[PDB]
Amino acid sequence: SLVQFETLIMKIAGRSGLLWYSAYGCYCGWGGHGLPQDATDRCCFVHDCCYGKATDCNPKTVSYTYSEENGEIICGGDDPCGTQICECDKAAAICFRDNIPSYDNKYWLFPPKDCREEPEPC
Amino acid sequence: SLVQFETLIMKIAGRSGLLWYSAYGCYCGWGGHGLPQDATDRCCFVHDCCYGKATDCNPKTVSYTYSEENGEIICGGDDPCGTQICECDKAAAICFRDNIPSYDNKYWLFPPKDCREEPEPC
C-alpha cells in the first residue's frame, strides 16, 4: 500500500513522503512526462517503472508484510504481486535516503508546465 | 492506462489533464491526505476511491478501449478489471468537465502541508 510506502520512507529516510516528496520534480506525483530533474526525481521514475511491471494487483491497495532484521527490511506475504510491490517500495525509500544530500527545494512544487517531454523508456 | 486517462480528460473536459489537473488540490497528485478543497479536488477524491476498488489489475498501466457513441464515450476492454478502470476515468473527466465554472487556480500547486488533515472513508 501507499500507507505502507509512506511508513517505509519515514522508517528508512526519516522524512515524510507527504511533506518532502509528493510534489518533488517531474515524477513523484502524477508522473508520466518530463525529464528527471535530478537524482531524487530519478528515484521516482525508477519507482513507477517497477510498479509498472506488476500487472496482477493494484500497487496502491495491495497490502504486504515486511520484517526488519539486523537493520535490513525483508519483503514478504501470501501475495507474490504484493511482495513485488513491497521490494519496489523498499528501494525507493533507500533511493530517497541516499539522495537527500542533493535534494533541492527548487524542485519542490515543480510546475508540470516544465515536464512535457516524452518520458524515456523504462 | 495513464495515457488513456489523459486522452479522456482532453476529449471530454477539453483540457490538458497535465496542465489543469495534475497538481490540483490535496488529491489530484499523490493523494491519501487532507480534505477535498472544492468540486474539482473531490472528483479526484472519488477517482481515487474508484481505483481502490480494483484489486486485480494495475490501474495506471492496464489498457482498455473506449468508443465515441454520439456525445458519449463508451468503455470496453479485454477483461473486466480493464473495463472497470475505464469507468473510473470516464466518470472523473465528466466531473472535471462539469465543475469547470468553479475551477480555482488557488488550488493549483497547493502545498501538501495544508493537507495534513486525515482522510474520510472512501
Swiss-Prot record, chains A, B:
Ca(2+) binds at Y27, G29, G31, D48. PLA2 catalyzes the calcium-dependent hydrolysis of the 2-acyl groups in 3-sn-phosphoglycerides. It is found in: Secreted. Disulfide bonds join C26-C115, C28-C44, C43-C95, C49-C122, C50-C88, C57-C81, C75-C86. Its cofactor is Ca(2+). InterPro entries: PLipase_A2, PLipase_A2_Asp_AS, PLipase_A2_dom, PLipase_A2_dom_sf, PLipase_A2_His_AS. CDD domains: PLA2c. Homodimer. It comes from the Eukaryota. This is Acidic phospholipase A2. The active site is at H47, D89. Its main location: secreted. Expressed by the venom gland.
